[model samples]
Target: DKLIGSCVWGAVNYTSDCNGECKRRGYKGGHCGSFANVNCWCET
Candidate 1:
């Protein structure tokens, strides 16, 4: 099965920033992008 995925780009420096923001918005998990500037990906 496939879960919904979401992404955001912003001025963040750590994966926890992404995880915290995504979790705060009700996402199950989140991580920083592998490439490029401050990107966050989330899944539920």
Candidate 2:
């Protein structure tokens, strides 16, 4: 959670394995990055 947020703002970064989670969420690559003031969520 916090780690993801940090990476979004260039505070941190992930390796090439982020695609597993990113793709599951319909995102491309390993970087979904920041999304502003909105709370992130997942839907089935």
Candidate 3:
């Protein structure tokens, strides 16, 4: 089976910093570019 995931980047307000939080979660930037938003899926 497969699972679907979604993530958003860029903070519009001080209380909402999804991008920073996602990074702290263990997500890293990519080469050629870095993304504030991230989304992925994996087998369960």
Candidate 4:
């Protein structure tokens, strides 16, 4: 999945920043999901 890409690089704006990034990248939706990292998981 194209979701392999990450949108941010920190914990500060993981949710907000990535969400915007997802939208900007043409994804349908997004979330700051991860177990040990900031995975900007988006629904593409």
Highest lDDT model number = 4
TM-score of 4: 0.51
Model 3, span 1-44: residue lDDT tens: 12133434332322133344435555442111125534432322
In candidate 4, list every pair of residues with a backbone clash: none
**Candidate number achieving the greatest TM-score relative to the actual structure:** 4
Q: Residue 34 CA error for candidate 4 (Å)?
A: 1.6
Candidate 4 residue spans exceeding 4 A from truth: 4-16
TM-scores, all models, native as reference:
0.47, 0.30, 0.27, 0.51
Question: Mind giving the per-residue lDDT tens digits that candidate 1 earns over 1-44?
Answer: 11223233432344545567667777867765545534556765
lDDT of each candidate versus the true structure:
0.52, 0.39, 0.33, 0.62
lDDT of model 4 at residue 3?
Answer: 62
Point out the worst 10-residue segment of candidate 1 by lDDT.
1-10
**Superposition TM-score, candidate 2 onto the true structure:** 0.30
Task: Give stretches of model 2 more than 4 Å off.
Answer: 1-16, 31-44
Query: Compared with the true structure, what per-residue lDDT tens digits does model 2 show for residues 1-44?
Result: 22222233343443234555555666653433446622222222
Give the Å shift of residue 43 in candidate 3. Answer: 16
> What are the RMSDs of all candidates, in order?
5.6, 6.8, 8.5, 4.0
Ranking by TM-score: 4, 1, 2, 3
